[PDB]
Design a protein around this ligand. Structure first.
Ligand SMILES: *[C@@H]1O[C@H](CO)[C@@H](O[C@@H]2O[C@H](CO)[C@@H](O[C@@H]3O[C@H](CO)[C@@H](O)[C@H](O)[C@@H]3O)[C@H](O)[C@H]2NC(C)=O)[C@H](O)[C@H]1NC(C)=O
Ligand SMILES: *[C@@H]1O[C@H](CO)[C@@H](O[C@@H]2O[C@H](CO)[C@@H](O[C@@H]3O[C@H](CO)[C@@H](O)[C@H](O)[C@@H]3O)[C@H](O)[C@H]2NC(C)=O)[C@H](O)[C@H]1NC(C)=O
Ligand code: CU
Ligand code: CU
Ligand code: CU
Ligand code: NA
Length: 499
């Protein structure tokens, strides 16, 4: 069952064996992935998070981010540790009380402390639209049509060297899959469809690192949503999905009744499908209960290309139709050396006092904010452009902005910008050497918004900056509840920190 929009959510430690190998984890709702949190557009969500963690090897503090939800007027509820709050300590709870006006689509939630989400704290978050403009394109859209793609590690995250090329041990599809080494024939996930019906498959990357080449043997996929943004229909036979991205696609159950492989090939870790790695099963009602015998093509004739996507609504692009054609045009220098990432010459290391609390305590320019050099102010009611030229090791890097979605004016692997009708999204691959992926948005949401690579190992190694959007209006726009004001005193007392 789905939970929400008003619900408790307990965060616990438990052993799990999603690929046959037992290890302890950090779980929401007792499962991997966590339960789906759901509601309708404009609803009030109140997710009271109970931190019941006791195993220090995965951290006993926690904080949860609602990925892709704008949090307008509720910056304090966004979740990134030391940006919008101090962590919740064990044996305490915290009500994330916010609203979702003007958003409907496929999202997710995850820990936003250190690399803790890699240890298991990740689940789907779906905001349905009772008047969805795509409703007539499908028959079925429910918890059974969510497809999660996850990387899974046998080593605990706090034992992964900072700045290293860290590699997974299994791909999990809906929580199940097989290990790349010492492979055992552990259970595969099954997605069941009825011949003749059309399904809104909500594809969610909950990855900590790899991108996946996702396909379904014998089937194609008609994209209708990108990171929460309704799209024009785009039919593809393969989707390369980067960490934290989401797509809705229509699956037409129009092939013969049978069993078909579902494939998710990561860019690192195990290559291919030997022993049923990187796989799940699409089963038609009435099919024999047996593994598929289908094969992939040698090459995919209609892969997703990001410049082919266009919004369903007339969203346009803010600003003027040329590079630098914005009120505040930025170019970030994105680099890696010696195990650490940097942005504009500064490697991100979380501050002792969360950025939001520094601003509410009176610090009002970005040079007064800590970490020094890691906070850039943005002016209010302005068009912002951010060029993100690639080249830093460990690519392709999927960059994500909190508090906002953005027009993708220039995409990976294509030097031509689009000032007319590019897709809008919230996480974007910045591509390869010589690319100049560029995003635009308008500043109508006061507060500190994290910008970072969504390969969690890279964020841990410093690949982040904070956009302090409209510092002067942050306090009036974001009144804070007493329970939020209590978080840093409690956390600092528990950890013997002075501030
Ligand atoms: C990606 O696109 C951005 C624009 O969106 C390009 O930024 C431009 O970068 C050049 C230098 O590479 C800038 O010109 C330089 O300016 C300094 C003075 O600030 C001057 O001293 C240098 O001689 C040179 O003129 C230009 O200002 C800038 N545009 C903006 C908005 O900052 C960037 O080069 C592109 N990157 C790649 C890898 O294609
Ligand atoms: C590289 O990225 C550029 C920019 O996003 C892509 O260019 C766009 O290509 C589309 C599709 O062909 C062009 O739209 C076409 O416009 C014509 C004339 O209106 C229309 O009759 C066609 O039906 C279609 O709508 C679009 O104008 C063009 N934009 C720009 C700024 O050049 C390009 O396709 C991408 N390259 C690859 C290999 O995908
Ligand atoms: Cu995220
Ligand atoms: Cu986010
Ligand atoms: Cu990265
Ligand atoms: Na425009």
């Amino acid at each position: 069952a789905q939970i929400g929009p008003v619900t408790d959510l307990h965060i616990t430690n438990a052993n799990i064996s999603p690929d046959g190998f037992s290890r302890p984890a950090v779980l929401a709702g007792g499962t991997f992935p966590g339960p789906t949190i759901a509601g309708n557009t404009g609803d009030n969500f109140q997710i009271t998070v109970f931190n019941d963690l006791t195993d220090p090897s995965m951290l006993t503090d926690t904080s949860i981010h609602w990925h892709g939800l704008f949090q307008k007027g509720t910056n304090w509820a966004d979740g990134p540790a030391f940006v919008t709050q101090c962590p919740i300590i064990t044996g305490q709870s915290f009500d994330y009380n916010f609203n979702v006006p003007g958003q409907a689509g496929t999202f997710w939630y995850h820990s936003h402390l250190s690399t803790q989400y890699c240890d298991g704290l990740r689940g789907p978050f779906v905001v349905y639209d009772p008047n969805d403009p795509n409703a007539s394109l499908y028959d079925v859209d429910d918890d059974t049509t969510i497809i999660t793609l996850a990387d899974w590690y046998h080593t605990l995250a706090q034992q992964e060297p900072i700045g290293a090329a860290i590699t997974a041990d299994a791909t999990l599809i809906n929580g199940l899959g097989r290990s790349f080494t010492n492979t055992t024939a552990s259970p595969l996930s099954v997605i069941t469809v009825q011949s003749g019906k059309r399904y809104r498959m909500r594809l969610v990357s909950i990855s900590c690192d790899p991108n996946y080449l996702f396909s379904i043997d014998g089937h194609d996929m008609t994209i209708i949503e990108v990171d929460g943004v309704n799209s024009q229909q785009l039919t593809v036979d393969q989707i390369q999905i980067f960490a934290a991205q989401r797509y809705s696609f229509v699956l037409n159950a129009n092939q013969p009744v049978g069993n078909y492989w579902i494939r998710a090939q990561p860019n690192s870790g195990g290559q291919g499908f030997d022993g049923g790695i990187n796989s799940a099963i699409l089963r038609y009602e009435g099919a024999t209960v047996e593994d598929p015998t289908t094969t992939a093509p040698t090459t995919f004739s209609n892969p997703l290309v990001e410049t082919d996507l266009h919004p369903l609504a007339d969203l346009g692009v803010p600003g003027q139709p040329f590079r630098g054609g914005a009120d505040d045009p930025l170019v970030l220098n994105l680099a890696f050396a010696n195990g650490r990432f940097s942005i504009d010459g500064v490697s991100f290391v979380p501050p002792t006092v969360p950025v939001l609390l520094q601003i509410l305590s009176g610090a009002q320019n970005a040079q007064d904010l800590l970490p020094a050099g890691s906070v850039i102010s943005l002016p209010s009611n302005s068009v912002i452009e951010v060029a993100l030229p690639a080249g830093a090791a460990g690519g392709p890097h999927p960059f994500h902005l909190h508090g906002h979605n953005f027009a993708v004016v220039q995409s990976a692997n294509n030097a031509t910008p689009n000032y007319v009708n590019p897709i809008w999204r919230d996480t974007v691959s910045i591509g390869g050497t010589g690319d100049n992926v560029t995003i635009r948005f308008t500043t109508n949401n006061p507060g500190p918004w994290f910008l970072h690579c969504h390969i969690d190992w890279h964020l841990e190694a410093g690949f982040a900056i904070v956009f302090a959007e409209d510092i002067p209006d942050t306090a009036s726009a974001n009144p804070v509840p007493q329970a939020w004001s209590d978080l840093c005193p409690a956390y600092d007392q528990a950890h013997n920190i002075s501030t």
